[PDB]
From a paper:
However, original CETs exhibit significant residual protease activity, leading to nonprocessive (reversible) ligation and limiting their application. By determining the crystal structure of MmCET, both with and without a preferred peptide substrate at its catalytic transition state, we uncovered the essential elements responsible for the high-precision substrate recognition of N-terminal motifs.
The resulting structure at ∼2.1 Å resolution revealed the atomic details of how MmCET formed intricate interactions with its preferred substrates. Given the overall elongated shape, its recognition by MmCET can be likened to the jaw of a crocodile biting a buffalo leg. The bound peptide substrate within this N-terminal binding groove adopts a β-sheet secondary structure, interacting with these upper and lower surface side chains. The peptide bond after the aspartic acid residue at the P1 position could be attacked by threonine 1 from MmCET (note that the T1A in the actual crystal structure renders the enzyme inactive), forming a transition state complex in which the C-terminal substrate is directly linked to Thr1 of MmCET via a peptidyl bond, while proline at the P1’ position is cleaved. Indeed, by observing the conformation of a peptide substrate captured in our complex structure, we noticed that the Pro-Gly-Ala sequence at the P1′–P3′ positions is highly unstable (orange color) based on its bond angle constraints.
Numbering used by the authors:
A (entry chain A): 1 to 192
B (entry chain C): 4 to 20
Write the structure that this text describes.
């Protein structure tokens, strides 16, 4: 999975893949497949099914999950898991010169960080994060605008989907010029 | 085991610009 965002002085852009993977089978087997998938080892959807067969894990892949949206001028990106009855979730809130990060601890979406000014934020496994970070640093220039950031994030999303089967080729992009306070949105989410 | 993100487990990458 991968959610990436660029926060600038005049707005913010956010992109997310649409892949959702469910695993079914014994825990040591699922854990072995997961490690291979989140390491960049499995590149194609063909190699993923061959590996699931090998480890005796049934895998369903769904490529229509909207991971980014825009509520009140604030962009919201989310990555989530399910493991041993534990639901884990991380959200990114972004607007012009504004950002916040919150995690689902138990039943409450809890703010873990925030910042002002310009930033690039990548949400993903260690592999997808290093690849997107490398693509961003390679193409971003100091005086680049929000429009250049759109092209860059598209290139990041395409480069990652070419290297791993943990991300889908299809992706979404939301953008805003609004400077609405993201902390307001994180408070609204805090309960439920 | 719903979803393919280590993004929930692995920590988010934050780069200052």
């Amino acid at each position: 999975a991968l959610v990436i965002a660029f926060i600038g002085k005049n707005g913010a852009v956010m992109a997310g893949d649409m892949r959702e993977i469910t695993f079914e089978g014994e825990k040591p087997d699922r854990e072995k497949l997961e490690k291979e998938l989140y390491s960049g080892s499995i590149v194609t959807d063909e190699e993923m099914q061959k590996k699931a067969e090998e480890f005796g894990v049934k895998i369903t892949v769904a490529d229509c999950k909207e991971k980014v949206s825009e509520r009140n001028g604030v962009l919201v990106g989310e990555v989530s898991s399910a493991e041993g009855g534990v639901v884990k979730k991380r959200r990114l809130y972004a607007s012009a010169g504004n950002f916040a990060i919150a995690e689902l601890i138990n039943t409450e979406m809890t703010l873990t960080s925030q910042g002002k000014g310009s930033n690039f934020i990548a949400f993903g496994n260690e592999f997808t994060k290093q690849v997107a970070n490398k693509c961003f640093k390679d193409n971003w220039t100091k005086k680049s605008n929000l429009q250049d950031a759109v092209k860059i994030l598209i290139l990041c999303m395409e480069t990652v989907a070419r290297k791993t089967a943990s991300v889908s080729k299809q992706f979404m992009i939301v953008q805003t010029a609004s400077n609405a306070d993201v902390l307001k949105v994180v408070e609204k989410d805090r309960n439920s | 085991a719903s979803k393919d993100p280590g993004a929930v487990d692995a920590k988010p990458l934050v780069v200052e610009i």
